[PDB]
Every structure is written in C-alpha cells, then in structure tokens.
C-alpha cells in the first residue's frame with residue numbers, strides 16, 4: 211500500500227516524519243570541559259526519535275520486526291551522522307551537535323572523524339542540498355545499509371525513493387542530464403557516510419542491542 | 434572531459450587489467466594467505482597502470498593520484514574479485530586456479546564474515562545482471578570517489594575536475610542503459626541500484642582493512658607513489 215504513494219505524497223510523508231532537534235543535557239550555567247558523555251547521552255536520546263521516524267518511512271513497517279531491527283542496527287550511526295551534517299551546513303567549520311552544543315575542530319582519533327563530517331557538510335553546502343533531498347537520502351540509508359548483510363520489498367521502496375528524488379529535481383527545473391548527475395552525486399556521498407560510520411564505529415570502540423531497538427519499536431500487542 | 438560516452442566505455446574496456454593466476458607450495462589452509470597476498474601484490478602493479486588510463490586521472494597531481502589510490506585500492510581489488518566471481522555461485526574466484534568456498538574461509542578468525550559479504554555482492558551483481566561495461570564504469574567511480582572527501586586553490590581545482598569526470602561517467606552509465614533499451618524510469622532506478630552497491634563495497638573495504646591489520650600489510654603512500662611516479666625514459 212505504501213508503494214502506491216505518488217512522489218509528492220512520498221515527500222510530504224517524509225517531511226512530516228522528521229524527528230525533532232534535541233538539546234544537549236548540560237547545565238549551561240556550569241563549567242564546560244565530559245564532552246563524550248554529553249555526546250553519548252544526546253545520541254542515546256536521538257535514537258528513540260530515529261525509531262519513530264523510521265516507522266513513518268513508507269514501506270518500512272511492512273517488514274517483519276526482526277528485519278526492521280536489523281536495518282536499524284545497520285543504519286543508526288549513519289543516520290545520526292547525516293542529521294548532524296545537515297544541521298551543520300550553515301555553520302562552516304563547525305558541527306552543530308545541538309543548538310546549545312556547537313563545536314569547532316579545535317574542540318585521540320576524534321579530529322579525523324570531525325574533519326570527515328565537516329567535509330560532508332561543505333559538500334552539501336556546495337551542492338545546495340535541499341530538505342526534500344535530505345529526507346530521501348536519510349530514508350535510503352535506513353533501507354540500504356543492512357540489505358546486503360541479512361529484500362524484494364526493500365528494493366521496491368528504494369526504487370520509489372529514487373523516483374521521488376528524480377521528481378524533485380525535475381520540479382526544480384534541472385535538465386534530464388542534470389537530474390541523473392545530481393542523483394549520482396547524492397548517492398556517492400552515501401558511500402562517504404558509510405565510511406564515516408565505519409571509522410566512527412572504530413573510534414567509539416577504541417552499540418544499541420537488538421532488544422533495546424525492539425523495545426523502542428513498541429511492537430503491536432497481538433502477536 | 435571531451436570524450437563521448439562511447440569513447441569513455443572504449444577507453445575503460447581497453448584499460449582493463451588482465452586476470453592473474455596463483456602460483457602453480459601446494460594449496461593448504463596454512464599457505465592460503467601467502468598465496469592471496471602474493472596475488473594482490475601482483476594485481477596492484479596492474480592496478481596502477483589501469484588507473485593512469487582512466488580518463489582524467491593523470492590530469493591530477495601525483496600527490497592526489499596517490500591519495501585516491503591509497504583510499505581506493507582495496508575496494509578496487511574487491512570489486513574485481515566480485516566481478517570474477519559473479520558466474521560462480523557460492524564461490525570466490527581469486528584466480529582461475531584459486532576458487533574458494535566459504536568453508537575454506539573459516540580457517541582465519543574473521544575471514545568468513547568478509548567472505549560472506551563478498552559472496553552477497555556477487556549474488557547482487559548476478560541478480561542485477563551487471564554488464565561488463567557497467568562494471569568498468571563502477572570501478573572508475575570507486576577510483577575517483579573514494580578519496581575525494583579526504584583531501585588550497587589547486588585542491589579546489591582538482592576536486593572540481595574529479596567531480597566533472599564523475600559526471601561524465603554517470604552520463605556514460607546512463608548512455609549504456611539507454612542503449613540497452615531501459616526506460617528513463619528504469620535508467621535512473623538502475624543507476625541508483627548500482628551506486629548504492631558502492632556503499633556496500635566501501636563497507637567491505639573498511640571491514641577488510643581491519644581484518645588485514647588483525648593478521649600482521651597495506652601499500653604505503655611511498656610505495657604507491659613509487660609506482661605512480663614514473664619517469665619518461667622507457
């Protein structure tokens with residue numbers, strides 16, 4: 211039934227599903243120093259809203275809960291990262307983790323990933339990434355990050371998102387050549403977001419459990 | 434940059450490296466990694482020659498060429514392996530005389546996880562019926578794209594050039610698919626499917642990089658620079 215939405219209906223649904231921007235849980239009256247504790251706590255709170263968002267991506271909830279959890283397990287860090295890059299676009303050289311937690315690169319192994327995220331924000335700024343495009347990209351990360359590491363339904367939803375992205379670019383006046391060129395440009399940034407998630411995962415080990423994710427998904431009560 | 438799509442395909446097909454063999458030290462679990470390392474080392478030399486023939490690559494500085502190869506070489510080995518393996522379900526065709534199944538990939542801690550990811554990519558290629566012309570385009574995208582987000586006025590010019598070459602490879606992939614008779618819808622859908630596989634190949638390369646370091650092991654910047662930094666005396 212979700213595969214029957216029009217491109218405009220798909221965009222509207224994704225825009226409406228957007229999660230809120232959360233704040234860091236630091237007392238702004240106290241001394242600043244604890245950064246990883248604040249960032250970890252923010253990420254933990256941002257996961258619940260991510261799950262609520264995922265449940266509104268058309269087609270996601272037609273999957274079994276087991277497969278929903280596996281997609282979230284694969285995608286959650288990439289999704290946190292692309293959200294961070296999106297909100298940092300208009301803050302050259304800085305990362306807007308929260309509206310009260312804007313850090314620059316001067317604030318072991320952290321700067322390497324900080325620089326990669328700053329480079330993604332700058333690429334988004336160079337391409338003039340639109341909000342409608344960003345929500346489609348985030349939905350593609352959710353469905354594609356865990357699809358090879360477990361499928362037909364996932365691929366049909368991914369195809370619908372590609373159609374929606376192309377529709378947005380055609381509506382913006384791009385030529386057919388510019389549409390395919392921009393689609394490729396946006397999807398190649400996803401490979402860099404995967405790379406960052408991989409390197410970020412290494413840095414953090416230097417993971418939300420299946421049960422935690424399943425609990426956040428709040429299963430229906432008639433099994 | 435002025436090549437047509439047809440000329441791009443032709444240049445990429447002509448640049449393709451040869452399929453190398455393993456030595457004919459009999460094969461055993463104990464000798465496996467030595468055999469695979471020796472093969473990869475020989476493939477890397479041909480990979481350098483191939484890269485210099487990818488349109489637009491040698492227009493970049495030496496330093497940037499090295500950086501792009503440093504970031505891409507394992508992905509390139511892997512996608513080559515997945516392509517060689519596409520017609521052999523359940524097996525990885527490292528060489529025509531070195532065709533392994535995943536039970537052979539269990540002797541080393543952490544190998545079977547990567548082996549399975551590679552088999553899954555091979556299966557995906559097969560389900561998509563990936564064409565040879567599409568493959569060489571994807572391999573060229575990996576070369577130009579994997580390191581472009583990890584690099585001055587010269588750097589800005591290099592990045593603009595890389596993105597222009599990437600755009601012409603996109604145009605080439607679309608041309609191939611149009612020529613194959615796909616609708617415009619099917620063309621953008623297949624372009625997206627192909628490019629999303631590159632995210633999985635990046636993931637496999639990062640996991641592979643961790644596995645290689647767990648064992649002992651990469652081409653140094655200086656080694657890659659030595660092979661790329663050729664003289665003109667031959």
Ligand SMILES: CCCN1CC[C@@H](CCc2ccc([C@@H]3c4ccc(O)cc4CC4(CC4)N3C(=O)c3ccccc3)cc2)C1
Nearest residue numbers: 249250252253254256290291294320323324410417418419
């Ligand atoms: C209860 C189960 C355990 N939990 C479950 C979930 C797990 C959470 C681990 C965790 C801890 C911290 C981050 C932040 C963070 C926070 C919010 C954001 O939106 C984005 C980010 C981006 C990010 C990922 C790179 N990050 C860093 O700090 C960082 C930024 C630049 C350079 C180096 C590091 C994300 C994720 C811990």
Ligand SMILES: CCCN1CC[C@@H](CCc2ccc([C@@H]3c4ccc(O)cc4CC4(CC4)N3C(=O)c3ccccc3)cc2)C1
Nearest residue numbers: 469470472473474476510511514544547548641650651652
């Ligand atoms: C001083 C210079 C040092 N050299 C520089 C170059 C470096 C070479 C390290 C090196 C050693 C071995 C591989 C093989 C290999 C060989 C050929 C192929 O086409 C592809 C592959 C694929 C690959 C990377 C995953 N692999 C494995 O074994 C493997 C396969 C499945 C699961 C787990 C592991 C590649 C690369 C060492």
